[PDB]
Structures are given as structure tokens and as C-alpha cells.
Amino acid sequence: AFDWDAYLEETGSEAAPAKCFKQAQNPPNNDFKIGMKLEALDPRNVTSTCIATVVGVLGSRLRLRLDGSDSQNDFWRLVDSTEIHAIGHCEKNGGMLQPPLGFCMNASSWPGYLCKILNNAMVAPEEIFQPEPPEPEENLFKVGQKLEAVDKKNPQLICCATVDAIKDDQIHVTFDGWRGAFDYWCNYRSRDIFPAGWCARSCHPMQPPGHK
Ligand SMILES: CN(C)CCCC[C@H](N)C(=O)O
């Protein structure tokens, strides 16, 4: 557990208040199990809803892999993400499940494939998907404030970070102790940022500053 209070005192810094974040006040319970299938937007084509399997769980997050794709493009979503739903959600809403961009077979093999993977599949029940947290009405972050942020280049990691700059609804996230290469702009509504102390509360590892 990272000592945020000692860290904020020594850097003469404030953590961004919880009201800045589109995150729940308390980290949502994660009742997903490895092997459970669900529906997720394909990160490599966000127009597509695809079948994903939980291949890992960490705190309130799921490590997801699209069935029929590859093991090199796994992605992480919170259990209260609006980009994941129970199987059947897409159809109920007038849509059609799609092959993943990285589908390992040819496209005419898709309809048969879906039948095969869904047959006696372990499926995440709709009740374990958590409600979408309220969002702030505006960007309330201020330059200099610290927070916990996903390293988008190594998304298993959530790390000590600082708001470097602000432009309207976008905040600039920089990772304490790391070269500016891991920096990124995101919307203040990002699900990839958390108030200080959130990881410890959710049982997710939280990376201390880098040694540079
Ligand atoms: C924590 N995060 C901001 C940086 C992670 C970088 C790890 C990588 N293997 C490296 O050593 O470059």
C-alpha cells in the first residue's frame, strides 16, 4: 500500500478530489471469474461488439481477450465500464455480434464460430455488471494535482501520476519519476484515472514513482 499522505506532504502537493473523477465513491465489487464470457467493444474497432473472455481479474478490473483473436492484445476494463455487457445485450438492442479485428479464421467462418464458442459457455450473469458511476458536470481537475492513472502502454499498471496541464475537457497526465514518453492527454471523464488511495481500497497494486 503506497503512502500517499507522506508522498503528498514531501512533494508539497494535493491529490485531485474524488469529485473530479468518473469513478464510484467506493470501488465496485468484482465478482467475475476467469473464463466467463461477455460482450465488449473491440478496442481495435470500437464500432464492433465482440465476445470477450475474462482471462484475469485485478481489483475492480477485468483483463479481457477477444475469442478467436490472439493473446497479444488483451485489454483492461472496470466491472462498471459501459463498454462491457452480458451476452445477449447487443441483440436485445438491435445489433449483431462481430468477429474481432484480429480474428484467426476467415470471415465466412464467423457465424459457425460464434455458435461453437457460445455452446455450454461460462457466461457472466447480468447482475455482476456494476452500474455506471456518475460523471462530473465539468473538468474540476487543477494543474499540479496528483492521482492514480493507468499506464496506457502497460495497462496492467496503475501508477502515481500528476496533472501537468489542462485544456478545456482534457487533462495531461504525467507519471512521477518516468520520462515524458508515458504521458498522455485524456478526457476528465476517463475511466483510466482514479483518486489517490483508490487502488489500495480496491486491492489493485499501485506503482510508486519511477527511479529517474
Ligand atoms: C510505470 N510505467 C509508467 C512505466 C512502465 C515501464 C516498464 C518498461 N518495461 C520499462 O522499463 O520501460
UniProtKB/Swiss-Prot annotation:
Compartment annotation: Nucleus
Extent of the MBT repeats: 2-100, 108-209
Subunit organization: Scm associates with the PRC1 core complex containing PSC, PC, PH and Sce/RING1. Forms homotypic and heterotypic interactions. Interacts with the SAM domain of ph-p via its SAM domain in vitro. Interacts with corto in vitro.
Family under the similarity heading: Belongs to the SCM family.
Domain characteristics, as noted in the entry: The SAM domain is essential for function.
Role of this protein: Polycomb group (PcG) protein. PcG proteins act by forming multiprotein complexes, which are required to maintain the transcriptionally repressive state of homeotic genes throughout development. PcG proteins are not required to initiate repression, but to maintain it during later stages of development. They probably act via the methylation of histones, rendering chromatin heritably changed in its expressibility.
Entry protein name: Polycomb protein Scm
Lineage of source species: Eukaryota, Metazoa, Ecdysozoa, Arthropoda, Hexapoda
